[PDB]
Amino acid sequence: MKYMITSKGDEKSDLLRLNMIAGFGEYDMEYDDVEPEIVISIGGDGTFLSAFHQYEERLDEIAFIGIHTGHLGFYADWRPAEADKLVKLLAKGEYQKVSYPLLKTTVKYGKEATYLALNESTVKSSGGPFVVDVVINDIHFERFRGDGLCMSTPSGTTAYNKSLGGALMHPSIEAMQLTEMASINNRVYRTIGSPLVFPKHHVVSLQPVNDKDFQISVDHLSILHRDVQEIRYEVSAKKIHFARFRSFPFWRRVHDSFIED
Amino acid sequence: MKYMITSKGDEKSDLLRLNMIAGFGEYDMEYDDVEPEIVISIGGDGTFLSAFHQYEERLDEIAFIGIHTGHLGFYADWRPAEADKLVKLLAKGEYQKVSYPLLKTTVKYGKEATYLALNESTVKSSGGPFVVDVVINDIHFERFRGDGLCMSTPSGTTAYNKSLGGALMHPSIEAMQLTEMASINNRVYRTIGSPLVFPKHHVVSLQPVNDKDFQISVDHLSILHRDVQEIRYEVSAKKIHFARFRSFPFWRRVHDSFIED
Amino acid sequence: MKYMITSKGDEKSDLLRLNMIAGFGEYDMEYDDVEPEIVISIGGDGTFLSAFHQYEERLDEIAFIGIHTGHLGFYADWRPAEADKLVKLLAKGEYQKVSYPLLKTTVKYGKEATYLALNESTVKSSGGPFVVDVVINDIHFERFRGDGLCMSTPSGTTAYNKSLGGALMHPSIEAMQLTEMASINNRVYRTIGSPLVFPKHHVVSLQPVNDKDFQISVDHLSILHRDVQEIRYEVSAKKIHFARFRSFPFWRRVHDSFIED
Amino acid sequence: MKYMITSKGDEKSDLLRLNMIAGFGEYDMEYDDVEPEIVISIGGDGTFLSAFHQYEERLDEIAFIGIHTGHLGFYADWRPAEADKLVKLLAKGEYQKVSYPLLKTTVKYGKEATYLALNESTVKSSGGPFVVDVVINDIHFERFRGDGLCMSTPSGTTAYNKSLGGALMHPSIEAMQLTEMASINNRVYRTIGSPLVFPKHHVVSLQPVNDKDFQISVDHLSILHRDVQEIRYEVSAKKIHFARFRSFPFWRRVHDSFIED
């Protein structure tokens, strides 16, 4: 079908991209970066996240594939030496699709903005103390004081979430995971401490206590939001679809990245 | 239907148990501790775990309810002052049932024993260094050296799992969670560090490296197993059923036990 | 001798301050906020840190005392109801002095600025990834990637340091403690993980890898530093002196703040 | 002077030991394993700990040296290829000595036993729940419930202590460090969480609450102690002395073992 290729933009990735486009030229395949059905990302996980956000409006019409020009990625999990075999199998089609859960972030003001994250969304203070009330399904759960909070998708769990002590979750689980950044706990201040894992349909809302300005991140994007009344998290109805050409199990990808490769 | 009541065995719990049996005497309800359809446990979570293991062969024919004579429990989540209202509503029936996932542990030797856990199963060494190979769905994932490992159900996540840094998981998620106890990590030895969350149908197998004797726990029961060839973990096909009489959400129960009550 | 009193500036603290000044009026004591020998801080630990930084140039000529108008402080460890007894004993003098270690931070550019911290100094990135080389006594120890680093004095250990997993250290130990904020560790990136405790005379230097802009904090003060070549940490030669009027051991103060009071 | 050599007992270590004894035969050096002044340990850190405990009664008359036949050790920090140069320099003498702090453990019953640890002493329960009262300098600090507690020397901090989240402390600091093993913290149970670092002269006492049987370890030795009334920890007056032949800084040894070598 229609396809496009994004590149990290270094010499290696651009050449690999030109070679695949030449290869695709020998099949019924049209290059179209407006309405692709296949999006190939050549670079690291940073490049793959950008590809995801470039096409987040057509997630259900796109299958993603990632090629790693440097080290193994979690999203960019094919090697370059296999580009030609990838060209071949993508051209024929008939490939299986694999779907991972995504996170919906809603920011309400005194309008409303919604974002989709593939890894995570984080909340930190503008320039002072961070204090927020955490409300779960309309029930007040804790008053959080500390550096910030992180809400991760399952495939996000190997990223920022892991650095904050979160658990690694297989991406077939439709869930989101909330971790703390440097929480204060003394006689007067009290948080759960532990990461929290939420199923689909649960809503976690962060509400300002004093300061209403916050730094909010979604994957790579970080934006100062002013006059915030609420930040809301829930597992998205939308999913990201990967074109699958061979078996590469999530736990093997974890082993290869963290234990040994 | 037929019901029974277990007691922690202190003065408070026994009296409460005698009072409920007297109350049940005013309805069509037969006391039968052989084939009950309702099992009321009066005591702490320790008492409730024993009630679960007393009837683990008839899980699909029993609905459990727990009354806490001391502090709030996660399983024993009704107060004693409400015993009479509980008598009433249990007698009529028509109550809703709530189901939580369980963990299947299989121990293989050079026969085979299987256990069901409501909280967790743990593995530690007999008397020396603990070294085991962790294999996930037949893929070698890590060689673990340290004090031990813990595999938790979702309702188990607030117990031993929490103490070991694991995440708290809503019990509607069909999953198990593996946490490390004091893992060694240096130049030569390497584990994932992070807790790992597994969906239904994934199989985690622990295999001996040198010593084949291990201390294996399942909830309260701890047994030295000799001549072990494998310990296997998977989400059970079986579930524990709770009689539900009012709303008491899992996250509110977490708040009440860990943040404030 | 000469004394001054700083206030949190709320109604309670100002009144208490006016009452102590009236009380001091009945002894040979002169109010002088230029060259005091006694500095009384009335408020929380935030107020006490400001008092410390107001007089950091005359540390060896000043004995500090803190009164807590709200909850117990670590520095502001006297109750208000005891103000009059404090007036009395401070007036006579002959009190013992207690000394705690401080941290020296040196920031070098392409000039040089030095700061003194009572709690800690932290380093975070301006707006992008944080990557720094950590050099200990001229030996390259690790390349750190993550959110930031924190260097704590012993009395600082109960503050930000504690939130980041650091150990609590008795303040009679002349040392500083380095903790990580959200370090990345995978196949390619590698940090020690654990907090590190350094004795007097050891020098820890942070050196930029790519970006040379950093957010540097010292206690309450947070400043964006541009064109940084090095951040250097060492236990200061200077100490903060407390006027001691009764026994209140550090570990009891830890118990009272974190376990129960 | 008089010297002896202990071996791990594998083929490599025994041969290396025979070669050094032959080499020492060309100098004024007498082999004496009763009253040596130099103790050479050839093997891992396990072998070196045994050498330490073999001669713990003559610590002030002995200088230790460790050769690693396998991977780098923290105590056994010389390579085998340098045995001959070690022979040479040890024979002449005039070498500098380096001293590390040790931990004194006292166990009181309803007599009294004292032990010296080079790494750590740990306390765990015999077979049930572990509950102990932690008393610091006669002040009740916390009631600890969980798996156990670990008290580490500074050179011990890179061992068991590190696995439990403790800080790594330079061995020139005369201190001991207490870490928790799987502490329970809920509404009803409360521990400090954080590792605690104690200076010389502070006394930490563990006192039984219910069960008075405990598994107590000191380095490699693990013993079930019955009828325990108290376990007492303090920095020892005794020190272990190392023969120093070249510079190998503690932090470089940490880097080489944990970051890269």
Ligand SMILES: CSC[C@H]1O[C@@H](n2cnc3c(N)ncnc32)[C@H](O)[C@@H]1O
């Ligand atoms: C160093 S900043 C983030 C690092 O983690 C990588 N990363 C990005 N997303 C993920 C993910 N989902 N899982 C693991 N690593 C990730 C990035 O490629 C980079 O190496």
Ligand SMILES: CSC[C@H]1O[C@@H](n2cnc3c(N)ncnc32)[C@H](O)[C@@H]1O
């Ligand atoms: C792939 S580049 C963007 C990703 O970097 C990852 N990241 C940012 N900061 C950290 C950190 N301190 N540790 C691990 N990953 C991080 C976040 O998961 C983000 O989605």
Ligand SMILES: CSC[C@H]1O[C@@H](n2cnc3c(N)ncnc32)[C@H](O)[C@@H]1O
């Ligand atoms: C102190 S040993 C275990 C403690 O945790 C409690 N407990 C048992 N099971 C659970 C659970 N599933 N979640 C939280 N606490 C539990 C027990 O009642 C006891 O307080």
Ligand SMILES: CSC[C@H]1O[C@@H](n2cnc3c(N)ncnc32)[C@H](O)[C@@H]1O
């Ligand atoms: C309710 S009594 C049995 C439970 O005690 C809990 N338990 C045992 N040891 C610990 C611990 N160190 N921390 C928290 N819970 C524990 C385990 O989850 C077990 O199922």
Ligand SMILES: CSC[C@H]1O[C@@H](n2cnc3c(N)ncnc32)[C@H](O)[C@@H]1O
């Ligand atoms: C909530 S931001 C910092 C919190 O920790 C307190 N704090 C400041 N310094 C210290 C310290 N050295 N030890 C413990 N708490 C501190 C402050 O008073 C406030 O409660």
Ligand SMILES: CSC[C@H]1O[C@@H](n2cnc3c(N)ncnc32)[C@H](O)[C@@H]1O
């Ligand atoms: C007393 S107000 C200033 C202090 O707040 C403390 N602080 C800032 N952020 C945090 C945090 N996330 N956790 C604990 N303490 C903090 C730092 O130790 C600082 O010195």
Ligand SMILES: CSC[C@H]1O[C@@H](n2cnc3c(N)ncnc32)[C@H](O)[C@@H]1O
């Ligand atoms: C695997 S059991 C202990 C492991 O830690 C090593 N070890 C023993 N003592 C120390 C120490 N003081 N610091 C670091 N590692 C140690 C042992 O040699 C072994 O590799």
Ligand SMILES: CSC[C@H]1O[C@@H](n2cnc3c(N)ncnc32)[C@H](O)[C@@H]1O
């Ligand atoms: C060198 S062999 C003895 C040492 O093994 C180390 N050890 C035992 N168990 C562990 C563990 N789980 N993690 C790290 N080190 C350990 C302890 O520090 C002990 O002194």
